[PDB]
A paper describes a structure:
Thymidine phosphorylase, providing pyrimidine nucleotides for DNA repair and replication, has also been shown to have angiogenic activity in vivo. Here, we report the crystal structures of recombinant native hTP and in complex with 5-iodouracil (5IUR), a substrate with a Ki of 0.48 mM. The active site is located at the interface between the α- and the mixed α/β-domain.
All four copies of hTP contain residues 34–479, residues 32 and 33 can be observed for chains A and B while only residue 33 can be observed for molecule C. At the C-terminal end, residue 480 was observed only in chain B. The crystal structure of hTP–5IUR complex (at 2.5 Å) consists of a dimer per asymmetric unit. So far the two reported crystal structures of hTP were both in the closed form, based on which we can argue that binding of 5IUR in the active site of hTP leads to closed conformation. His116 directly interacts with 5IUR via its NE2 group. Almost opposite to His116 is Arg202, bonded via its amino groups to O4 of 5IUR. The other residues which are also involved in hydrogen-bonding interactions with 5IUR are Ser217 and Lys221. The iodine atom of 5IUR, appears to be similarly stabilized in the hydrophobic pocket. Apart from the residues that interact with 5IUR via hydrogen bonds, a hydrophobic pocket lined by Leu148, Val208, Ile214 and Val241, contributes to the stabilization of the molecule by holding the ‘iodine’ atom in place.
Author numbering:
A (entry chain A), B (entry chain B): 35 to 480
The structure:
């Protein structure tokens, strides 16, 4: 029974396959209570799991629901990428459609926000009518039509993970190697993918700031994934500063769109082309990293990524007209069709100097307490709330120049909140420089 | 917010008084979700709390509800006793009315089962009509007409403890010195007592088997109690074997009534007189402890605690006729008036030998899975389920002599169930001896 299983883990003992499957079944069928879920999640977070338990949690979460079947004509076309989570990380919003443009099939099952990081599903929900929950049947139609699709956990698609994911988010049990591994792979295993690239963040606002832990996760994701029959590669990418300039939901959707019609900040386009190019390589569609990167980049310039993105929006519930407007509209028009915070508050530079860095963690934490993230499961988010980096890293600015614009619904920023933000603006006084790219290294399966 | 409070404790940090009161209010008002209550509890169970946190929790729980207001004329009479939970530990049932058999006012706020231990509130419920939820007003009337009462936590009395109590029970977070401490003391502080005696168990079926760990609890209980302006004494008693010969709920009420009949097992009576003795002394209604143990014992026969029990039962919802029935009724009559298990299964001595011990834990565990224990929240119990020790410790026996009577409602005992219970009977080659007395020592407040 639940109390005993929890007790074993609490004592630092391992769970047998039956126990794990037992636990997962109880979660899915609703017999497990919230406290028991939270208790077990914490026991794991604090005591851990070995690679066998871990692999078992994965198979279990994966099997708690359906297995996605596709036309065998799609077999080698099926690919996906997943990010462990970060700030301003709307890569998936761009990659999904940019791949489906290269003929690739992407049945992406992602998630909502986790802790201080943003979830792509919450970002898509900024778009009116976008429905994250799609059946396995609709998903097939989606791939047939736009060859794109970004859905979330549901009754049919990894329900066990859906429930745990939402509990982890608000029980301080996000940063657990085995829970992240099972959660991520279970989603991807159910997809029947040919290749998969997981973007494992490291740095300031990463689940695992510590680069060495980012690595351990990277190697584990790939190892367990391999052992479970999935061609997987992991990319370790910086998340010390936000990706792009926009952080939030509604705001990140417009930057994603800016990226899709050939523009946007270089770091964003870089990560998109490097992971996509790494993904095309992994799946055999591209000969080398550079070739695959170029094809994806071409999709960003082509207008075909944006086009696939448009079909996806319409096929997942967005009114065709709004879909055509988001993709056909200019930055300002998109900004108007998407949720908007009630107040705009710009932060000014405290001095002259170079933007050495903009701490992503402090920024996400404040964005978090302003309604961008959850502190309770099922809690509505204030889509619209977010932030815009008005200055890039590597550029020089003077005191008095606005470097950040906070989009908020509530009161003017609190005291400790303002301090935290300014605190995030690191300045040095040297010549301007070229900001480095997020991507660090690729970890392949043994 | 909740997620952060949990992370702090999760990481080993202590919670500020504002944090704990913050968390407690969230538990009482609903903002804290099940998974969050469980996460917090497990974090605390694994990273502990310090004396101040513990002290602060205790206050918060006590203050989560109402403070019981009594007529000044009683102030000096209001006493109570508590247990850390055990097996067959029906002492409060016998001791509460026994005390009220000496003018003392006992507004006992106890609780339900906790882990593998039986709760007196569950025991009282096997008594048709008995209500455990009495508002403060009813509690005054009860003491006024019967001198005692046994109620449970409610929206009005320690709401916060009620919630943590029910969750800890099914989350393997019962055995936490600080949680037990705040839980026990919070209920007592709200009672406005002038002396509290806690029976801290140690032994095979104790929350804290290790006698030294139990002593740490006993010290904390008295220490923190003292710091909160409550005269508290704590006894340390054995729980390697079951207190009495009857384990369960309806069955525990019968053996209890037998004790209030001036009969029963030495086990029970001995413990009820000792702790009661310590109580009357502690509160000043007795010059010494032996005199108290004497007045209490007298009440078992003369002065009538059985008489006080009847008035309590009636005053707490039990039909007056049934109440008198249970009192004047003899064992056989008592059984017919209470819930009886559907069937009866007896175990036979696996071999000749002297009964060195009847391991309480294995007993509780099995009775537990037959419906005597909870596995979820308010999961209903099978109150007639239990066991009768058909043999005493110290005696010898021959293979074939039934040593245990199991009262179950479902299927006959299973293989692993029978094996578990058999392994509970420890036969030694020694000569017949007299079973020792539960009581070990008494820790005091100065
Ligand atoms: O699906 C997931 N993405 C990111 C993380 I971190 C996780 O645990 N699961
Ligand atoms: O009221 C209580 N009795 C026994 C235990 I153990 C506890 O934690 N609380």
């Amino acid at each position: 029974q639940l109390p005993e299983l929890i007790r074993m883990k609490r004592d630092g003992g391992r769970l047998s396959e039956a126990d794990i499957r037992g636990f997962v079944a109880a979660v899915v069928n609703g017999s497990a209570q919230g406290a028991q879920i939270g208790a077990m999640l914490m026991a794991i977070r604090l005591r851990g799991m070995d690679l066998e338990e871990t692999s078992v949690l994965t198979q279990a979460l994966a099997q708690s629901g359906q297995q996605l079947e596709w036309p065998e004509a799609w077999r080698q076309q099926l690919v996906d990428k997943h990010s462990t989570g970060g700030v301003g990380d709307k890569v998936s919003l761009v990659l999904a459609p940019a791949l489906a443009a290269c003929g690739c099939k992407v049945p992406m099952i992602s998630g909502r926000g986790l802790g201080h990081t943003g979830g792509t599903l919450d970002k898509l929900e900024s778009i009116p009518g976008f429905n994250v929950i799609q059946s396995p049947e609709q998903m097939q139609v989606l791939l047939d039509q736009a060859g794109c699709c970004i859905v979330g956990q549901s009754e049919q698609l990894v329900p066990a993970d859906g429930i745990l994911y939402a509990a982890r988010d608000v029980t301080a049990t996000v940063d657990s190697l085995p829970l992240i591994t099972a959660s991520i792979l279970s989603k991807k295993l159910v997809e029947g993918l040919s290749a998969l690239v997981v973007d494992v963040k490291f740095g300031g606002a990463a689940v695992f700031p510590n680069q060495e832990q980012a690595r351990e996760l990277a190697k584990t994701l790939v190892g367990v994934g391999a052992s479970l029959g999935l061609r997987v590669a992991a990319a370790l990418t910086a998340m010390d500063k936000p990706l792009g300039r926009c952080v939030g939901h509604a705001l990140e959707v417009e930057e994603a769109l800016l990226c899709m019609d050939g523009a946007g900040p270089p770091d964003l386009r870089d990560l998109v082309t490097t992971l996509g190019g790494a993904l095309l390589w992994l799946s055999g569609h591209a000969g080398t990293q550079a070739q695959g990167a170029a094809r994806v980049a071409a999709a960003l310039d082509d207008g075909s990524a944006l086009g696939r993105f448009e079909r996806m929006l319409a096929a997942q519930g967005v009114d065709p007209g709004l879909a055509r407007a988001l993709c056909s509209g200019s930055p300002a028009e998109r900004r108007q069709l998407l949720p908007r915070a009630r107040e705009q508050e710009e932060l000014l530079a405290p001095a002259d100097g170079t933007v050495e860095l903009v701490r992503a963690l402090p920024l996400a934490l404040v964005l978090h307490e302003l309604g961008a993230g959850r502190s309770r499961a099922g809690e509505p988010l204030r889509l619209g709330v977010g932030a815009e980096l008005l200055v890039d890293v590597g550029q020089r600015l003077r005191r008095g120049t606005p470097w950040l614009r906070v989009h908020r619904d509530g009161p003017a920023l609190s005291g400790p909140q303002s301090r935290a933000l300014q605190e995030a603006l690191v300045l040095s006084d040297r010549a301007p420089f070229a900001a480095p790219s997020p991507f660090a290294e690729l970890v392949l399966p043994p």
